[PDB]
Each structure stands twice: as C-alpha cells, then as structure tokens.
A paper describes a structure:
The arginine route involves three enzymatic steps: (i) arginine decarboxylation to agmatine by arginine decarboxylase (ADC, EC 4.1.1.19); (ii) deimination of agmatine by agmatine iminohydrolase (AIH, EC 3.5.3.12) and (iii) hydrolysis of N-carbamoylputrescine (NCP) to putrescine by N-carbamoylputrescine amidohydrolase (CPA, EC 3.5.1.53), with the release of carbon dioxide and ammonia. N-carbamoylputrescine amidohydrolase enzymes belong to nitrilases, and more precisely, to C-N hydrolases breaking non-peptide bonds using Cys-Glu-Lys catalytic triad. The octameric MtCPA enzyme is assembled into an incomplete helical twist, made by four tight dimers with swapped C-termini.
Instead, we decided to construct the MtCPA-C158S mutant. Substitution of sulfhydryl with hydroxyl group preserved binding properties of residue 158 but strongly diminished its reactivity. The structure of unliganded MtCPA-C158S, determined at 2.39 Å resolution, presented significantly lower noise in the electron density maps around the active site when compared to the unliganded wild-type MtCPA. This improvement allowed to identify the ligand bound inside the active site as GOL. However, GOL does not penetrate deep inside the pocket and presents no direct interactions with either of the residues from catalytic triad. Considering the fact that in the MtCPA-C158S mutant structure, GOL enters the active site, and mimics the substrate or product, the niche-bound GOL quite likely might represent the secondary binding site.
Numbering used by the authors:
A (entry chain C): 1 to 301
B (entry chain D): 4 to 301
C (entry chain E), D (entry chain B): 5 to 301
E (entry chain A): 5 to 188, 192 to 301
F (entry chain G): 7 to 301
The structure:
C-alpha cells in the first residue's frame, strides 16, 4: 500500500526571546533552526528583526544607524552557511541600508545556500511602541514570490500580514505557502489593547481565501527601550502558528514559551484543492480598480 | 457608550418552492427582528424559492423577473416603510436578455435605493450558477440608509477579500452577505462551514467593520436534467464585530433571529486609529487586476 | 494574379491518449501539406477527449503551462519542417488561472503568441465555465508568412463581435477550431445547421473567408452523475468571403479540406463593397452593455 | 509694463477654538487686501493648535470632509467679497483615508480643487505620518484670475522635486503654508536658517517668486506620554525670482507681508535664462529611485 | 568620533599660457595640502582663458583626448605625492565629439574615471554648443580614499536634479568647478550662491565651489569681449551655511573639515530621503511638463 | 515672431514620381522666397480620381506608416527648415481616409488629421472613397507656430475654423482641389468658395491659406470620360479676411505673405470676440435637423 503521492514540504515557525546583543540572538536562531531540521523541517521561519530588540519603540537618530547594506551582510552570510549545511530554506530579516534609503527587509536563502533576493516591507506601521514609519522607507520591491528547492513561497513582513492585498498578490503569482515573520505585543500607551485574536483571525482569513498554508513567527518576552521621553515596555505575545489552506490552525504556540512548530503539507493536493474550490477562476479584476484608490474614488498615480 | 448606534439582524429559515409561503415567512421574521429592536434586517439569498441552481434547466431561467415593478420588492417596501427598517431584497433579475443574481436595498422609509448585481458566480455540482447569471456589472456598491452607510454583496461574493475591501474603501460601515451554502452533492465529505466563517471573519477584522451573514437551512431536493439532486443547507448564520469576533451565531437547523447593536462612531474611530487604511499601498496592488499574476485584464 | 494562400481544415476522432492524438494530427497535417496547404487548422482540445462533459477536480489538472509545452514544441518542429502555419489548441495553466488557449505557430516554427478563449459556454455536455477563466487576451490577429490571420476558439464562433473585432484589426482569414455535437440532456437538439449559418454570416459580413475544424466520433465520459455521451457531428467547412461554402465534410468521415484564396482580390472586393467605410461606431455604445442599458465597468 | 500681482504672507498665533482662528485669518486677509494684495497665504492647519505633537485616536476624528467644509465655505465668501485668491489648509477625511490638504479659492469665490500633502514628516513634535496618508493628487498648478500658481504644503517645501514639478506645469509663483518650530526632544535644533535657504534655492533654480507663511507662538499639547511643547518661529517670507528675500517677518509678532511682482517680465527673464530649455530629463531617471538604483513601481 | 575629511576650494586668475596655469594650480594645491586638505578643487578649464566666449574654429584645437592627457598625468603624480584627491577639469577630444569634462584622481594617483558636463546652454548670448556636446556620462559618484564624492561642472550648477542624482547614489560631498562673471549691468553672484546653498541644504551634504577671478579679453567674430570673473568660491555645509568664502579679486585657498559620519547621521534623521515620493516625480522626465522624453 | 507662409498652385499628371518632383521644386522656390511654412494641394500624388467610383482606385490608398512620399518630403523639410503639410490617400486596416500629415522643420512627423466633411455629387464622389474622419479638428504646434490644418471641403464649414481657433490656431491652412462640375457647366464656384473662407478669417481674426489645383483632367469612369477644369485661385487671406496674395485660374504660382503673429494675437485678444462668445446658447450646432442632438 503506497503513500499518498505529491510533493511534501515540512515547514516551521520558531518563537523566542531576544537580547539587544546580535551574537546572542543569532546563536539562539542557529540553535532553533537546527532543532527544527532535526524534526524534519525544510523551510524555517525566524521572527522579525531578530538581531536585536524591537527598537522601534523609540524615534532615535542613533538607532537609524543600526541599518546595514544587503551586500556582504554578516548575519546573512552566516545563515547562508547554515542553510547549505542543513539543506533548508531560511528567510533572513534585517534592517537594510541602501545609500540614503532604509528598509525593513528580508533576504530569501535557498537550501543550497543561494541568496535568491530580497523583499522590502511595503506596509509600515505607526503609533506608540511601533514607530516604524520613522525608520523605514515604504518598500519598493512589490510583493514577490521565490522559487526554492522545495516550493514557490511568498514572504512578507509583520504588518504586511494585516493586508489581504498582499496575500492575494503573492498567491496570484504562484506562492504555494505564505510566511510572515512578526514582532507584535502589547501597546505602551493603552494596556487594554490585546490584539492577538484579531491578528490570528485576519491571517487565517488570508489562508482560507487563497487556499494556501500560512506560517507566522512572532517574538516573546518583555523588552524595555530608552526613548526620547523615558522607558517604554512591550510584552511580546508569541502565538506563533501554522494554518492550513482552509485557515485551520494546525499548530500553535502560547504567549511565553520558546517554541519550534512543525507541519507537513502535500503541495500537490492543496494545489488541486485550491483550483477546484474555484475562487481564482471566478475573480473579477475588471471590478477591482477601486482597490487602486486610498479614498474610494481617486486612483493613485 | 456615546455615539450613533444601529441594531442589525440575521435571519435564518427554510424555504418551500412556493413564493407566497416564503414571503409570508420573511415578513414574519422581519417583524420579529423589529420587535427585538432591529434597524436593518438581512433576508437570505434567493429566498423566494428552492435554491434551483442544482439543476441546469431552460425552464428555470424563466423564473427571473424584471427589477421594475417586481412584486416581492414592492411588498417588502410596504413592510420597510411600516416598521422603519432597512431590508435588502434578493431576487432573480431579468434585464432584457441578460440575467442576474441581484439585490435591491430598501431604505427605512420604503424608498428603493437601487441594486447590486452579484459579481462572483460560482459553479460545480449543486451550485451551477454560471449557467443562469451574467456575471454582475454594477461593481461593488455602498448605499446610504437612514441608519448607516452599508455595503451589501451576495453569497459567493463573500469568499473574496477584494469585495469587502471595495465596500469599505467606499465608506461602508457594516457588510451584509445573504447566502445559500450547504453540502455538495458530488462529495459528502466536503463540509465548508468553518472555512466559510473564517474567511468572512477575516474580512471583518481586516477592514474593521462588522459583518452580517444570513444563510439558509433545511434539505432541498431538485429534479435535475440527470435525476434528483439534494443539498442540506447548514445555517450558521452569524454576526461578526470589527475585529472578526463572532458576537452572535445560529446552529445548522434552527430557524433564527440574531440581533447585535454596534456603535458606528466608536467603530469608525477604532478603524482609523488601527491604521490599515492609512498604510495601504495601491501603487503596489496593480497585480490584483490580473487573473494569472502577470497580465492585466482588458 | 495577387497573393494566394491555400487553407485546410482537418476533421478526426480523438482517444484520451495525447501521443496517439498528436500522431493523428501530424499525419493529417502532412496530408494537407502534400495537397498544397499553407495554413492547417486542428480542432479544439485535440490532445484528448472533450472532457468538459464532467465537472471534475482531477480534470482541471490536465492543464499545462504555455511555456515549454510538449505538444506546442513538437508541432513547432513540424511547422518548420513543412513551412506551414499551425494554430495549436491546448488547456493552459497560468499560476492559479486556467484558459482554453491557442498558440499560433508560423511557417518558420516561431511561436507568435496566444489567444485565450473569450466566450465560455455552459450547460449539459459543455461545462466549460467550470474549467476556464474567461479569456483576457482580447481578440487578436497574427501576422504569419502568408497572411494576417484571426484565430478564435469554438464557442467564440457564435459571436459577430469576435469576427468583427478580428477583421477591423486586419484579419484576412478567420479560423475557428471547434468541438461540438449532440447534447446529452436532450437528444432532439441538432445544432449543425444553425452553427454553420452563424459562421457564414460572419464571413459574408466582413468579406473574409472562414475555416472551421470540428471533431467527429462518440465520446463517453464518466461524470459526477454517471456516464455522459456526445456524438460529435463533424461538418468541418471552409467558407468564402460572401459566406458560400466551398468545402465541407460529412458527420463521420475523417477529412482533409483544401481551398485557395486570392487575398489581394478579396481585399479589393471587401473595400469596394463598402461596409467598413459605412460603419457607425458612434451609434454602437450599446454593445458595451449586457442588458441593453448599462455600460459595463 | 505687464501683469502685476501683489501677493501676501500672513503670520499669526493659533488658539484651540476653530472659529476664533478663522476670524483671525479673516482679519489679516482683510488687512492684506487693504494694502493691495491679490493672493493671500494663510499658514498650515490654522484652524487649531498643531495637534501632531501627539499620536492620539481622538485627534484623528478632527478631520472633516472636503465637501461642504465650513471653513472653506466661509473663506469662499470672503474671497468673493474682496476679489482675492485664498488657499485654505485643512485636515481632510475622505472615507477611510485622511490627508493634510489645501483647497484653492479663486478671486470670484470659485473652489478650484485641492492639493494633498505629498511628503509627510515624522519624529518628536511632528508625528504627521500617524495622521495623514501620503498625498495622491500629485503636484498641481491652479489657474487663478491673477496668475497660474503652485501651492504645496509645509514639509513639501524641503524637496526640490516639488518646486520643479510645479514650475514645469506653469506655476508663476510658489506658495508654502507652513507649521514649523522648535523640536521637543532636542532644544539644540534651530532649523530656521536652513529652512529659508532650501526654499530660496527653489525660487532661484526655477526663477519664480516664492511665498512662505509660518505660525508663531508656544503650543503645549497633551500627548500620550505627557505635555510636549513647540515654540513656533515665524520667519514668514516672500522671495523674488533669484531667491532674494523681499519681505520677512520676525519670530513672534503677527505680520502681513506684501510684495509686487511683474509676472510677464519675470516670465521673459525665465525664457531668456534658458534653464528649462536646457534640462536633461534623459539623465534624470535616478530621481525615480529612493535608493539610487531601483526604480519604484 | 568619525571619519573626518578636509576639503579645499582654490581660486585664481588664469593667464592664457598653459604652463603658467598648471604651475599656478600646483602651487595652490601644495598650499592646501600644507593646511591639511585631503581633497582639493581647481576651477573649471583652468589651463587657459575661458574661450567658450568666442565662436572660433581655432580654439577647437585646444581639446585633447582623455587618454594620456599631459595635464591629467602631471596632476596624477602630484595627487600620489601628497596623498590628495584632485578632480581635473579639461577640454576633451573624443572621436569627432568634444566635451567639457573632468577626471577624478584619487589619493594614490589612480584615475577613477570621468564625468562630462551635462547641461549645455543654447542661450541667445552663448553658442557654447559650438564647442561641447551634451554629456553622455550621466551623473556619477566616485569612491575615493576619503569619501564618496559627486562632481559636476559649470552650468550643471543651476540644476537641482543633478545634485539630487549624485546624493541618491551616496555622494557625501558635492564639487562644482565653475567659471562665471559678466560684461564691464546686473551681477549673478548672489543668485548663484543661493541656488547652490539650496542643493547642500536639500541633500544635507557639504558642497565645494571653485570659480575663477580676473578680467579676460578674447578677440572674436564681432571683435573684443571682456569678462570680469567674480570669484566668490566657497565651501558650504550640509544645511547650506557658508563656512568659508573668497572675495571677487584675490587668490584664495579655502579649507574646511567635515565629519562625514556625523553628517550621514544628521542627513538620515532629518528624513528628507525617507520621505521622497518618486511615484509623483515623473513629470521631471519631461521638458514641457506633459510629454516624457526618450 | 515674423512667420512667412506660401500657397502653391500646380498641374498634376497621373504619375506619383513626377508630381512629387513638382512639389519638390515649388517648395524649393517657396524656401528661396523666404518661406517658413509651405503648403501643397490636395491629393497632389496624382489626378483627382474621385470623378469615378471604381474599385481599383480605392487600392491607391497607402498606410500612414512608412509612406513613400511622406518620407521624401521629410528629408526636404529638414534640409530647408520648412514646415510642410502632406495630403495622401490613407489605408488603415479596412478603413480609408482623405488625410494630412504635418512635417515640422526638423523633418519630425507631428501627426495626422483626417478629412471630417466628405463631398458628394457628380465629379466629386468622395463619399464612395473616404470614411468620414475620426481624428477631430487639430492644431499642431510647429517650430514656427500653432497651425490649423484641415482638408478641401472642410473650408466650407465655420465650425471647423472656429474649432481650430478655440484650440490656439494662429494660422489656418486648407489644401484643396475644386473646379468645374462635369454635370452642369453653368455652376461657377470660385467667388463663393473664396468668400466663405474670408468670412472665417474675419470671424476668428486669423490669417488663412488655401492652395488649389489648376490644369484640365479627364478620368475614365464606370460610365464614360469625365472632365473637370480645376480653377486655382490659391490665395492668402489676412486676419480681417482681406486677400493679400491671390493666384490666377490658369498658371503655376508660388504665393507669399509675412505676418507678425504676436501682433495678430494682440489684435485678436483685444477685439474681445472669443470671451464674448455664448456656448450656453450653441447646443443647436450639435444637431443636424435643428432640434435633435446627435448621439
């Protein structure tokens, strides 16, 4: 009796705490990637801006200079080594310097060690605790998919995950799995804001509407940043998870543990399911021009 | 709790294949909803009869009727005006040689505010809608009622984030989806109800607007061109709030009246402060105007 | 005297094995070339059975990318070896979209592009809407070594708008690869005469010849509700520029049909007759509605 | 000899009451009119305190739609009465988008349309990116009774690209209503000389006059993390077409600045100077990057 | 703390004898170095009188090729001897085309490449196109031992786009060798400085300008033309503030130290480059404000 | 801005290459007489073929794209530095037009205008050949000036001149081929033709240029020989309508008038008639029958 045929891929969401020291956090990442591969993982997802604290609680001049070029990046070069050694795909999130522009970016490292390129975060959040608009130009790559040894994947970043347009754009270009490294928690100006359920439901919705699985890796722990106006704290709420192509959660972490989440998907069965459900056959792009507005009337240039 | 408040309702009932029975059933539940305080009441898809799209039959097409002087619409305008409630009326539209799965929005004073024509048309065993309906040519609309600016789409439209975003971008404060979905006659292992909820809950959370879904219940057996075909409609009518939470839900067999109050001033303030509309990137969305990921449609 | 072009319609039966059917196509293309053909037309979805009687998940996966398609690549070699133009019908996968498509191969083997079927039929026996996104190429014409040609697919042939669109853009000949027969739900529907008249109208109205290649044979497909059967009724034909039939096959024979046209003299006939001079696009806005009143977005 | 135009920059301190502040605008506009002004410029967001020191939910709901805006409508009445052109800065709600916008009223009261602020500043004291979508009108010029003018907003004034965009589309005069002062996290920043120089640069590069109107006063805002204070530094000015300052206000008093320009003489001095006939747009592609290599989508 | 760099603007009067002028350039480069200069700017076309003033067929001879240029080669030796970066303005012959050009020499004497003057006035009061084709290099930056630098030439000075183009590409200091004066009505010295302070301010990069001084009489098609070049060479900082300036009549050696790391951090925090909108800048690739050029 | 303009008036054979030799040699004399903008008569590539309605004549038409004649008149436009409008019979897929291409002084081809008003009747069976044009009226900005180019029968319609002058036209231009009628030798149209055009100039305050064919022409039709005598009277009119240079009905002519156009924009702008117009009252000009707007 034969196994069910089709390409299988094992994916992983990792969840951990960071210090504001880069060598410590990269060592933490190698360790969890290694544990993930030991559980059979093929593609492994590390959370947003893992090289340090989530520094965007402050709006500081000196924190802008934590950016580094994409070219010859020490963290990327090191994880390229790991990727080739274990035979796994590793997206690497980093703060990019590009002449006078800066971006929250992610380089996709393939399972032979090859850097396949970058995605630059398109949607940039703002407000207390999450002052990203001060640091990052809005991304200019557009939504991208990457052909890896195991799959065509879509990778976007954190706040991108709240936007249906991004998931769909990746899916229309052939993405077979979506990946969202993330940094999200409490909000220092209002301790009654607890966004964790809202956060999951919106992404489950992307998974179900595009009929693709979806991986989110989010940070844990409390971090305190010195700001222009005193110290500010966020408690990162974990809840890393993996969802299947109906938006079912197949694996989930809690709000405090370090975790290695693992799941297997038959990409050929899911392809077949995605097409028979028919949503991509029935879409109406002739009726979607209003999505190219911000205000419901006026197309942007 | 200061601000403009509005009470919405999802209804859920079984249909026969006789229009008079079904409209009497609708009148009964609209009155029950109003009794419980409702301002806007949502009746399910194609509620005038059995869900006839299980078959592909010449005679079934001639069930359509013109938007103009439609008797079912005209009768609920009288009810809308009597109770001062907004009532969207789903009907099978004939428009010269075109046909549409449509919906007419009656305001609380009985005024017909216009129509929306279903945009996304499903197909497959049990749900052969592409055989009857021209794909919709109104575009996604919003309507200004006495109580709120609302966005109404139809059934299968509910699977498409593009449709919810289009209504929200145009100022819709609450979304409405009358529906008819159940089992599928070619495969008894398909159970879409959780998948169906999750995708709608995602629209509500991504646009931060409340969302109302009225779905049919009961078994319906149609005589098709190839023999009997049966669907069991699974109910699960629900109301979701602006973060995607279910605040009110029905099971898969009970007749129901569901009721929720929403404060639109607070929800507006919340939707804006969360920031997604401030942060969208239409400059990077051109690929949504493709089907194949490469070629923009004409 | 003037530019002459010999066209051909092919009519044959299919199994559901690709290699068999392509072998068949190749055999008939060669036979037409031996009789002088420059442009040879193979029927719709000739790679296998007309599977659209069913609405099946597994049949959707018969589709294949346009890129490096093994059937198009095979027939490019044949085009080249023969110096003929060969429109190649295939079921296209393009990411999550799917189309009933056709690639136009020039007489030097060059893939000149594609047209994605625009009008998608539906109903018992012909459940095409389940399988194909409505085409997004628009109507096209293709400059080949012999002629500017307009190629659309099957059900497109019932629409005068398609023919007109092609002719306005310079098509000098129209081609319609086709799959059409009886209807499994009503044995009394016989569409063959109706089908011809409508196509003859297009030919007469635009003053351009027209070529239609249709399938033959009984096909029995297993569907969600049991067996379903179509007898395909052949009647592949070539019409001239006043819509007269110059060549026609019966409803069961395998056939190779040949006809020669003087394209310069037809052009001059088409201009002289006046219609493209007298068209009133100022008064045709209603054709951009479905319902006779509301223009589509 | 030629078309003369008298333009004015206004400068004043704002209170927390809308209708008080619009009356303040009315009084200074009347005073500019009396001294002969044809086009009068009011500072940015003059309806109230500069609220952008804070990032607050409730402050967002201070926005109002462009349609039937009561401050725009009141100012239309005044433009018509006095025969002056008045651009009106306001916080726009447009369904779920919000912008920092300006409506250009013509000397007969006619509302010519709006520009939405393109470049949105950020940082302590000036958290504008929390409130405004980046503008989607693009740079505009408006044809008024007296002159084609280019109006942009505040932070837009640091970008040579905006001033050039407007001059290329025919602006004869540039206007920049502004709100700028000290910064709450660093009392060592005094940007007023820098801010002047950058604008004087635009005037001189395009050979067009330029008007800037800036707020004065200390404003304390209750933020999400406590009181934050800006001292607005005035220095409203008018510059000539070589970038010379012809009129300038101090850092704490109300002012009405007046300057006359001969627009036909300046136009002629611009054509002669030839910079526009000598530009190299074939070499300017890199301006469509952020990072000096990748063109934006 | 940070990379500190000393830059210099030189100003002198030219004779119309080449050896004399190159000897003058060398004397003043050495003097800049003696005061600590790391990068030294010589004014445009310094090997002689400013001749674009005449429409003389004979002055076309003065152009020499980029390859093996006697003046460039001599200045290469001096760059390598003193450890200083020297951009060298010259009149380039290249194959039936001619350009107003400049070649960047690094502190080790390496020839890092060439920029060609992009904007060429077809004015009613010059036929400069007579000598120079419009440049085909586009705007460049060169990585030197001390800094990334952008260099442009004479009329380029007027064009905000050229300064922005160099800045987008990492230029940390801009250099503008020029030559400007007028007949013995108005004088453009303030207009010039204001436009240039403008570019430094908008890009938050320091900016060095070297302009000649002196009267010069050339015989021409009509007869005599005379120009009094007005000097005012200057160095400006990253907010456009003038930190050193020359007068209209004497030789000068201007010196200023910049901390390029502090300036980088200031430039990025001010935020102009984070906030640019290239999606709304297309009209800049038109001449007439409506039609794109090729 | 002192622009010089010319009307030309010459004989045609039915031979493309020779006729192009005559335009060549009269354009050259225009330019030697100081001409900036030089006009060439309608369908000058051969005889006025529209006396017959024959199928083979429709096939005289040519694509706009890489047109033999356009391309040669472009080399010459470039070399002399003169602006030259070029009449030709246009093929466009199955459509056909009576069309004109405006060539600037650097040889630059600036775009086409397509004859809007199509004559009909004996000798002038133009409705048989030409689709009514779909370009609209057009003003081409050239190096020398904003110019208004329409074709032949267009000269009869005040709306066409008025439309061109609302769009910035400083000069109007009309290449033409009119003369005797073959059905009725009593009909003399030369004074009537001159006068209608003079009434436009006056009404818009813009100079006007009408170039026209001379010489006799027999065409073999579907019904026998057919003869027009083309009467010239190629003329330049000023902005009051006064004719300033006028050719005869018989001989080859090179006309010239200098105009101070910045001075004529002042005469016009100051006369007040454009701002005096009442477009709220002109809806009736969008009907054919005097009450039903056309769709």
């Amino acid at each position: 009796m034969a196994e069910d045929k089709g390409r299988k891929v094992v994916v992983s969401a990792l969840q951990f705490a960071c210090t504001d020291d880069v060598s410590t956090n990269v060592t933490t990442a190698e360790r969890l990637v290694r544990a993930a591969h030991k559980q059979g993982a093929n593609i492994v997802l590390i959370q947003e801006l893992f090289e340090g604290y989530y520094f965007c609680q402050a709006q500081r001049e000196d924190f802008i200079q934590r950016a580094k070029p994409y070219k010859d990046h020490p963290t990327i070069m090191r994880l390229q080594k790991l990727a080739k050694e274990l035979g796994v795909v590793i997206p690497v999130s980093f703060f990019e310097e590009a002449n006078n522009a800066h971006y929250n970016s992610i380089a996709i490292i393939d399972a032979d060690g090859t850097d396949l390129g970058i995605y630059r975060k398109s949607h940039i959040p703002d407000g207390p605790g999450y002052e990203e608009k001060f640091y990052f130009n809005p991304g200019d790559t557009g939504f991208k998919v990457f052909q890896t040894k195991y799959a065509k994947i879509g990778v976007a970043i954190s706040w991108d995950q709240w936007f249906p347009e991004a998931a769909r754009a990746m899916a229309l270009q052939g993405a077979e799995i979506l990946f969202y490294p993330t940094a999200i928690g409490s909000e220092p100006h209002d301790q009654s804001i607890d966004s964790r359920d809202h956060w999951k439901r919106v992404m489950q919705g992307h998974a179900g509407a595009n009929l693709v699985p979806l991986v989110a890796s989010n940070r844990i722990g409390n971090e305190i940043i010195e700001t222009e106006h005193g110290k500010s704290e966020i408690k990162f709420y974990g809840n890393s998870f993996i969802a299947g192509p109906t938006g079912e959660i197949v694996s989930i972490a809690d709000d405090k543990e370090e975790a290695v989440l693992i799941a297997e998907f038959n990409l050929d069965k899911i392809k077949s399911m995605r097409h028979c459900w028919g949503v991509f056959r029935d879409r109406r792009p002739d009726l979607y021009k209003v999505l190219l507005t911000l205000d419901g009337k006026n197309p942007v240039l």
